[PDB]
Point group: C3
Chain length 240, copies 3
């Protein structure tokens, strides 16, 4: 495995996974690098695919490696620098080089890291595409009154609602179609742990458009792209 | 009660009160919105007047409501300073597509509102009160405000154990002064926190005496609100 | 005494010493020399008259800093910065001359960078020269991971590449580095299990600071 990737690219990519886990398996496939992981509680799941085209250079033959993702993140943080990634299959180390700086990261046996989850294909009733700013905002407001967040469609009005109910205060971010990028307004109303949804949203880069798949008392999925399109990230969040 | 007001106004308005108390009565008046409070130690008092002309729209009709200030503040915090906040009487607060329902409080459940009841008068640029307060704090938790009449000169000063400090503001560094005898000692932390609430460029009027409370006055909302603080002497 | 000094020049001055001790002795020029409670780190600051617009006491150093942050500072302890008047016993080290085998001149950024990377893996930092390749390394070794900022000639200001490889407390090197201005050129003298010295200038080359740090 050997690759050369832009600093912002890799940091956006590892940021998504690091929201849920501190160690992960990276699949080093011939035409993309991917990571999929579930958290310990089985409440959140992430699926990253970063196409070969996102790299300035990418060469991989199908291996899998196990990494301390918090260390590897800290390292990628030292970098518009390029980050050079080279695996030593012999010593089981990943060399990361950024200019003259060379960091040798000892791999972890993948068999020792949480089994990769299957993110189930769902046919949830509603689909909402919107600017990430709205999800930031609604999550900030909700956090004021509760640690639970409700995502709800008004199917008639084609309006997406991010809301929460506290002991006496309530909040409601109402997003009719003029504040959306698109909506299929099927029946949808689910409640989630706010903190998970907020950490997730925090990894989404600030100008990204987010796709939300939402039903009634089911998990929510969120999809977005990074690397000008050549990477895609999907989160899935179980309802509470 | 129905009012629409700019974010930066309401924030400036609530900040002055928040400095001193966590809840307050807001008197909803026909021509103006007003709050007055005193802290629990009964040492600092604030009096805010928010006139109609500060609200884009403002209709009120004599009521009064009790409010948890921290929360209403955090809510207003959510707007673009440019954004309008819609207030409608629980109090409903809407900002762009965001609506918040804030449960009032029994006004009778709150500390009685004070009324704010001097030889020198000093108008200066808030920036000198910042500096003066910051310097003084390095050396002490008591801060002395003193006029040197002859010299028509305002001093913000403090005496260490080891060290002292003195910010001397003669006429050139003042907006104007009526330099009556005045020399009075205060809790620096009360003055500092009050100061913290004053906007960066506001002009501040200080009334000062000899062993007497100090008052500070300044304007918000480009002129349509007025805030008075009074702080008891030591 | 009486002086009139640039705020930014006097802050960079006092910073280099403040980093090592909370209190100190001030003495053609101004100077301070102190070594830290553990006798491990030392500083020798020298400010030339020309660093001063106009130009032995024993100062409380963290307070002088706090006052200088209110800012030309007039020094007459009595301090004045515009309208601001602040009123604030020396009996209350030998930096050896070494001919350390190596001498490296480099941009400050590099040393920042090497220390930040080393810190992710250890609280010990290694400074090493590769004589052959005239390449300065800043490196660390962890429980399982390693880092090496390798700085060949192309990435240096100068190098006299003697044999040298010494190990140090990263926290003290990191504190020292804190006070060094962001675009300073730093000269390092280095040998084989010996103290390191760092030299840099302030006040436009009007001021010179030396640090020395004992090895581990
Ligand atoms: Na669907
Ligand atoms: Na919360
Ligand atoms: Na919480
Ligand atoms: Na008067
Ligand atoms: Na103080
Ligand atoms: Na204090
Ligand atoms: Na030498
Ligand atoms: Na460390
Ligand atoms: Na450490």
């Amino acid at each position: 495995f050997k690759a050369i990737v832009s600093a912002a690219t890799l940091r956006d990519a590892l940021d998504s996974v690091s929201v849920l886990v501190d160690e992960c398996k990276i699949r080093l496939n011939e035409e993309s690098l991917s990571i999929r992981a579930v958290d310990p509680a089985n409440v959140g799941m992430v699926d990253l695919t970063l196409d070969a085209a996102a790299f300035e250079s990418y060469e991989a033959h199908g291996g899998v490696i196990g990494v301390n993702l918090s260390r590897l993140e800290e390292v990628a943080g030292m970098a518009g620098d390029l980050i050079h990634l080279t695996l030593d299959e012999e010593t089981r180390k990943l060399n990361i080089r950024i200019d003259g700086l060379s960091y040798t990261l000892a791999l972890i046996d993948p068999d020792s890291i949480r089994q990769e989850p299957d993110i189930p294909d769902l046919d949830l009733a509603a689909n909402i595409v919107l600017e990430g700013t709205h999800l930031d905002r609604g999550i900030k407001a909700a956090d004021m009154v509760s640690d639970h967040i409700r995502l709800r469609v008004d199917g008639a009005e084609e309006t997406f609602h991010i809301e929460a109910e506290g002991d006496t205060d309530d909040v409601d971010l109402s997003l009719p179609p003029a504040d959306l990028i698109s909506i299929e307004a099927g029946a949808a109303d689910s409640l989630f742990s706010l903190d998970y949804l907020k950490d997730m949203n925090k990894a989404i880069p600030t100008d990204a458009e987010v796709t939300v798949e939402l039903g009634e008392e089911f998990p929510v999925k969120l999809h977005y792209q990074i690397a000008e399109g050549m990477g895609t990230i999907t989160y899935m969040l179980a309802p509470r």
